[PDB]
């Protein structure tokens, strides 16, 4: 199954067990608009984009999906919440709540 | 001096040796828009920037720029154009036990 963009922020993103919160201000991005971003609400730039990737915390993630290619040979591999690459097991987990 | 966003999807494009014309096809992005993304006129979106390095010519350019890092264990790279090639990763450490 293909995943929105903004999915692919998604997963990852819960993958490190922060909240848009902490992301936010590790790039420094607006909350208030960061809730539509990772919702996929509206495509984002590329500016705000890479400055999210680019993050020590996700740089295991940045063409893990961007093209559908983990890189482990350097530590990119695809997280828990992903659909997509794994290293353990499937983990298709329980979506909740609604934002 | 820094590179632009756009810059970083031309310095890499001319290595190829091919015109926006030649990518623009290749990824079935419009010419008439791309002329103005890899000039920087206006922050492309997520889904069409990602929809370039996808390809597999400019595979090796995903994260080279994103994140300026380069990774070649897994077939990354920096073009000539680029001459680039440089980050900071520090990692200090700390504790003790007074009290």
New interface residues.
């Given amino acids: 199954m293909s995943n929105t ?1 903004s999915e692919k922020i998604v997963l990852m993103r819960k993958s490190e067990y922060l909240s848009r919160q902490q992301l936010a201000d590790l790039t420094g991005v607006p909350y208030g608009t960061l809730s539509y971003y990772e919702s996929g609400r509206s ?5 705000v ?2 400055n999210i ?2 993050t ?1 915390q996700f ?1 295991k993630y ?2 893990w999906f ?4 983990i ?4 530590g ?1 591999i695809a997280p828990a919440l992903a659909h997509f690459g794994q290293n353990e097991t499937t983990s298709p987990h329980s979506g909740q709540k609604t934002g």
């Avoid at 961007?66 to 290619?69: A, K, P």
């Avoid at 890189?71 to 350097?74: I, L, N, T, V, Y």
């Fill in positions: 963009i495509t984002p730039p590329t500016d984009m890479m990737l680019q020590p740089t940045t063409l961007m093209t559908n290619q890189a482990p040979e350097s990119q």
